[PDB]
Paper text:
The Werner syndrome RecQ helicase WRN was identified as a synthetic lethal target in cancer cells with microsatellite instability (MSI) by several genetic screens. WRN is a multifunctional enzyme with both helicase and exonuclease activities and has roles in various cellular processes that are crucial for the maintenance of genome stability, including DNA replication, transcription, DNA repair and telomere maintenance. Dissection of the helicase and exonuclease enzymatic activities of WRN using loss-of-function mutations showed that WRN dependency in vitro and in vivo in MSI cells is linked only to its helicase function. WRN dependence in MSI cells was linked to WRN helicase-mediated resolution of secondary DNA structures resulting from large-scale expansions of dinucleotide TA repeats that otherwise result in chromosome breakage.
Our medicinal chemistry strategy was to improve permeability and lipE simultaneously, two properties that are typically anticorrelated, by using physics-based property prediction (logP, 3D polar surface area) to systematically search for outlier transformations. Two examples of transformations that lower logP while improving permeability are the introduction of the ortho-methyl aniline in compound 3 and the hydroxy pyrimidine in compound 4, HRO761. Compound 3 showed a dose-dependent exposure in the blood, inducing a stable disease at 150 mg per kg given orally twice daily. Moreover, SW48 tumours treated with analogue 3 showed an enrichment of the p53 pathway in vivo and confirmed the genes identified by RNA-seq.
Residue numbers in the entry: 523 to 944
The structure:
Amino acid sequence: DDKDFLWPAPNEEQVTCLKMYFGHSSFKPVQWKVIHSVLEEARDNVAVMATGYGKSLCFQYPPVYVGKIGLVISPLISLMEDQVLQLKMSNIPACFLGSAQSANVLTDIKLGKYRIVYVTPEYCSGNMGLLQQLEADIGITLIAVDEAHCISEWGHDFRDSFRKLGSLKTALPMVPIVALTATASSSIREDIVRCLNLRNPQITCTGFDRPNLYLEVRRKTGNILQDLQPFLVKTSSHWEFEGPTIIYCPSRKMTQQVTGELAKLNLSCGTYHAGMSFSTAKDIHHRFVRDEIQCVIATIAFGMGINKADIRQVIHYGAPKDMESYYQEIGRAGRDGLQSSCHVLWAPADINLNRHLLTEIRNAKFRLYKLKMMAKMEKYLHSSRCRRQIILSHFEDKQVQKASLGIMGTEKCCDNCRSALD
Ligand SMILES: CCc1c(N2CCN(C(=O)c3ncccc3O)CC2)c(=O)n2nc(C3=CCOCC3)nc2n1CC(=O)Nc1ccc(C(F)(F)F)cc1C
Ligand SMILES: [Zn+2]
């Protein structure tokens, strides 16, 4: 059930609004992540989606729920007109605001009668005072910037009309921005984050099947060097991995132990955990991105905001505690689209320890959410079925699942597919 992934749970008023104005009885997990971050945290977002299926709900739902205004900035005039028309058909007041609009329509926007207002980036930069007035008198729930990759000079479609959207955060500092694009390029994404002046944005990336990620689950011995030796290559008088690697561990103590063994081999590596000083954490991050260290041995604390496309290997040294956390972690591998591998090395004792630590969570609702995330991970680790099929069924839509049927069953899919093949 994908309702298990919704943290925190949507309330009855939110569900009633979804059914009444959008015709859905439930939120998809990625939509809920964006909607909740906007409503409760006013958080900036970068939502990358391979297709337009379920994209508009992320930015249309929040202003409708709070009865305020959502501004949508896009250069796709005909699509914006179609979306305005579909909103009106659902009894949601919406309009395309341009230089040709009537004074009667602009007066109703100023009075807070329209929930969604679509504008071009050119109209937006020429009428900032209007947006400041709307924020002061009504309140803008969010600003959605569609085709956000157009603000990047290294993208395939740079538009100067988008560069000016860099002033949105200075004109409207409390308004969260939801940048939308179909490109999953991590380098283009860094430029979107910077040029729009987004602060700690939540990043989501959905609709991609990623056949370049090989998945394997293997039993551990707990003898660290014995477990990691198959991944190592003797190079001169020291040892190395095939490429940039992240080893995710369940604890700070395990990161020190694993790094200690790899340091004995003079492997280029560093430790990362939330117990380190700010300067030491910055240096490991800096050295990994500059390729001055090949391998980072880390807790869950490492990973977000790393613009690194050539992570060739992710190793989870110990059973992951949470299926959702595992998904974010392996998603950091092979963002350049080249072959990468994601291996879990685990033992039943790791799961028993993980379960004991779960009893330490004081918030009962959160503890149950975490318990459900752990149960999904345990089932995945013990499974003899396709690993890719399990993961996509938990996190992706039916189209992406359907698209993965081409690699499923083949020698490049996962360890279970290779074992079933021969
Ligand atoms: C897991 C989501 C995801 C990515 N995040 C972004 C957020 N984040 C942050 O660290 C992060 N969060 C918050 C703030 C800042 C941050 O930086 C973690 C990594 C990502 O960076 N990318 N990049 C892509 C590409 C797709 C195709 O072009 C190349 C790049 N896809 C994602 N995804 C989706 C994805 O990987 N799905 C997926 C699909 C199939 C499999 C399977 F079955 F094959 F194994 C496995 C998986 C996981
Ligand atoms: Zn498989």
